[PDB]
Amino acid sequence: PSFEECFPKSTKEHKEVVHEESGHVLKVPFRRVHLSGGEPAFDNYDTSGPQNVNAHIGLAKLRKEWIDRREKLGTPRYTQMYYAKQGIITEEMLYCATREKLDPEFVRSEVARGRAIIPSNKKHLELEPMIVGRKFLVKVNANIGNSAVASSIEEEVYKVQWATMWGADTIMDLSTGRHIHETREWILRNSAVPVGTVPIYQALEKVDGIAENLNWEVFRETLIEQAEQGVDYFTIHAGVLLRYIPLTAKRLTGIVSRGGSIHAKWCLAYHKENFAYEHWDDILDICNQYDVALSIGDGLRPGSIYDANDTAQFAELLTQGELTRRAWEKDVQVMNEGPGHVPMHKIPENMQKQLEWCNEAPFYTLGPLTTDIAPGYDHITSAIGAANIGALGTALLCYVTPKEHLGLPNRDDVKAGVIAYKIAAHAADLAKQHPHAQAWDDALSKARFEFRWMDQFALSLDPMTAMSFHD
Amino acid sequence: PSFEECFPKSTKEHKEVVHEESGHVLKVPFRRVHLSGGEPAFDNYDTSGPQNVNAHIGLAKLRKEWIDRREKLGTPRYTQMYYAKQGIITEEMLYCATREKLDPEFVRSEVARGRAIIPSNKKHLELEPMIVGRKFLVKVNANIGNSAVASSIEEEVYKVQWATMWGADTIMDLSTGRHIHETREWILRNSAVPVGTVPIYQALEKVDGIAENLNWEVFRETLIEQAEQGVDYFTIHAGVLLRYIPLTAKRLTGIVSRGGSIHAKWCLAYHKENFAYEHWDDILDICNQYDVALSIGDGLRPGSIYDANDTAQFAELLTQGELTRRAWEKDVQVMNEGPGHVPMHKIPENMQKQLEWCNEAPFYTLGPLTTDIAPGYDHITSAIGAANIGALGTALLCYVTPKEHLGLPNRDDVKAGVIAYKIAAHAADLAKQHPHAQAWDDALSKARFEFRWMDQFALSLDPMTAMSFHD
Ligand SMILES: O=P(O)(O)OC[C@H]1O[C@@H](n2ccnc2)[C@H](O)[C@@H]1O
Ligand SMILES: O=P(O)(O)OC[C@H]1O[C@@H](n2ccnc2)[C@H](O)[C@@H]1O
Ligand SMILES: [Fe+2]
Ligand SMILES: [Fe+2]
């Protein structure tokens, strides 16, 4: 369906601002919901990106002049953190500031201090910049993966188009098997939102699924390949240390992280330290040339309520903080990945320890799921946890669909997950008293009170569901 | 569908215990989930009630000998609170204690002090007793209403059967229009769970929808009619005082409570104090003869995030506490109704004030909805709030379906609402570290880890959804 079909009475708009240092004109997307009865139109965030673009051609390379100008000026490092620490407000920073209705200097400050990141690989020229950080709107990530068999470019690109239509702020391409490189190229050239990956997945594919045949060298080659395409952030499980693995022996559900499992298998096979940890500095050198942000994985994530907040989980968290501070020494942007399965009373401890041990780097959670009892409904069990941990400061929420623990999500499942997570994210924005967040609730509630039905539906997260249910 | 179809590998069971004082044998329901691989069967709560019973005959009158014996002994008041304060452990108390795996004296103590209620009108002989209170499992209420046109007894009774099959602990019959008395009779004779009502709805129908023609007398007659049938609890909006009505003038969504609106209209028409407030003592006299519990309504509930925790809402809460203490002086069981629409940061204040101002009487919330932005998904927006406020001590959660704000729920909508609320309730049980609550999560997670797929599905809230999604 088209944008207009998904969001009746809404139009795509852009706010034009000038980047003072370069003279570059930025066109920052938003949506406008047109209302009745003398109400002013309501302006809202928009991640849906350019519409009706031929996937064989790809999106406009909107960042090209920004990247070209900085290259011509010359620079030792290419990261938003490097520029921020030099006192430079970049186009990306101004774009995010405009998008967030906040001051560009505030954005620069948050990025410089490591409390926000702008995942924006210089090779992802199609990207509409966005920011992740506790001082900003809570963001949502959706995961995609290519088809088991050969699919068309239209079919692959629709996965990003659909997730972002419903509000996904980032996506990750978690493809395995064949065609990883080719389909990721299709995604990046056609994605207006940041695209992350977990590079160890493709590295494992390069060695035919034999974890014991992994090593730094094939991982390094994989990082460069993905960076060259434009991947904006890498999940890297560098905190799964050899000595932490035995801490999982008494767990109910062991190591549930896919990347964590792979590293653990390699570590145990050789009794050697995690190669991503050992080569952390070399990873930073790669990231600095492209601006790939590092999402430090939580390979020792709890996979059951029983395992929540255990010794293994927090051992890794402590190391995530060390790795964070090391990355910042080289001006590499960082966020930290978090749980997982966590009952509600254990959520505050997670945020307290992360904020302290990781120097307020942005936190990126998978839920958490607040109970294990409802497979088929884990978008709900985890929306509860995501809203809670978002309220306490978590900056990015990885979605969970109704098919979690069960199977691959179809389009209905993906939409259900994104909607549930947009609810959690906005509920968290309200809880944080984020500026102007309540204006959205107020506009819909005013429409409800005044029986402006179409306006109520048009203002909601999913207008056609509301309208259909009413009919 | 049958119990077996809804819960494959589960059997309905009963734990037999003897009430020492009377010699009465109680058969307390539970379910048993039969597992594989040498796992012991897992025993869980069961509200589904007796299966395959002809609705034209009705359920067994299991409480008859209990009520008959107490009548023969003679008593001035018939409430569980009266008996508890006399030091008597009743069959109802022992039944609830067994059902909750807690001590009968503990149950008696909680009821005597007003911190738990056992809604159990002596005329509802079909009832399998249950308890509502912060020291017990968090409970869920589902609402039903009779058909707009003439429906069969099978069709009406299926509404209760369906809601309880998925875990509803109480129901309320909120029917309006024609046939209110007749269909409520069908429900009560065929309901194993407590049945509540909002008596002002039928009182309004008796005066042909003209609120100005209400008065104490027609309300009183309605209370007696409903009590005689066996209604276990009444929502009564006695805290909507005349002087509180102007406090709503600056609200965004005014008075959203149906009962509250009716009382407000009458109060404003005559400039006279709420007649349910004025006749509170007379209401208590009725309740004492049947054991009808009072659910003190929140007619000044906030209906939008904008109105949350405002002066009007808390003025009524203060009065709810006064009414609670007055009811206890006459040994009438009480719970208090709460919000509503409340953003997450405002939830703790709601619980703090209720616990203090209402002397820890059980709290009964409608959600709360944590954001207004997602009509069509208000089971999710409110599951977040319900889980949170449940974790802080709320004892009964009134469900919200995906059709909230939009239309009448079908069977799929009702199931979705009950499931979402069972998730919230159990998540709250975990957060409170309620004894043995985590054993359920652990059993499912162990099955997951060990690839015992059927066991995983059988242990879940909705086995056939999990199984189908996996397939
Ligand atoms: O390889 P593992 O299982 O750790 O990661 C799977 C996915 O989960 C996401 N995630 C987010 C927080 N913790 C894990 C991560 O970014 C990736 O999308
Ligand atoms: O008449 P009003 O709208 O107050 O009540 C509608 C329903 O909402 C329930 N409720 C629960 C808490 N507050 C309200 C109440 O028990 C009844 O089922
Ligand atoms: Fe999981
Ligand atoms: Fe509402």
Curated annotation (Swiss-Prot), chains A, B:
Induction remark: Circadian-regulation. Down-regulated by extrinsic thiamine, via a vitamin B1 derivative thiamine pyrophosphate (TPP)-sensing riboswitch regulation. Detected in both dark and light grown seedlings; increased progressively after transfer of etiolated seedlings to light. Up-regulated by salt, osmotic stress and abscisic acid.
Residues reported to bind substrate: 143, 172, 201, 237, 257-259, 298-301, 337, 364
Annotated pathway: Cofactor biosynthesis; thiamine diphosphate biosynthesis
Reactions catalysed, as given in the entry: 5-amino-1-(5-phospho-beta-D-ribosyl)imidazole + S-adenosyl-L-methionine = 4-amino-2-methyl-5-(phosphooxymethyl)pyrimidine + CO + 5'-deoxyadenosine + formate + L-methionine + 3 H(+)
Necessary cofactors: [4Fe-4S] cluster
Principal place of residence: plastid
Residues that bind Zn(2+): 341, 405
The UniProt record lists the keyword 4Fe-4S: yes
Tissues and organs where the protein is expressed, per its UniProt entry: Strongly expressed in cotyledons, leaves, flowers and siliques, and, to a lower extent, in roots. Expressed in all green tissues, but not in roots, seeds, and petals.
GO MF annotation list: 4 iron, 4 sulfur cluster binding; carbon-carbon lyase activity; iron-sulfur cluster binding; metal ion binding; protein domain specific binding
Keyword entries, A-Z: 4Fe-4S, Chloroplast, Iron, Iron-sulfur, Lyase, Metal-binding, Plastid, S-adenosyl-L-methionine, Thiamine biosynthesis, Transit peptide, Zinc
Annotated EC: 4.1.99.17
Subcellular localization: Plastid, Chloroplast stroma
Enzyme class name: lyase
Knockout consequences: Albino (white leaves) and lethal under normal culture conditions, probably due to an impairment in thiamine biosynthesis.
GO CC terms of this entry: chloroplast; chloroplast stroma; plastid
GO BP term (any one): response to vitamin B1
Cofactor: how and how many bound: Binds 1 [4Fe-4S] cluster per subunit. The cluster is coordinated with 3 cysteines and an exchangeable S-adenosyl-L-methionine.
Subunit composition and interactions: Homodimer.
Cited function: Catalyzes the synthesis of the hydroxymethylpyrimidine phosphate (HMP-P) moiety of thiamine from aminoimidazole ribotide (AIR) in a radical S-adenosyl-L-methionine (SAM)-dependent reaction.
Record family assignment: Belongs to the ThiC family.
Name of the protein in its database record: Phosphomethylpyrimidine synthase, chloroplastic
Organism: Arabidopsis thaliana
Gene for this chain: THIC
Range of the intact protein held here: 86 to 556 of 644
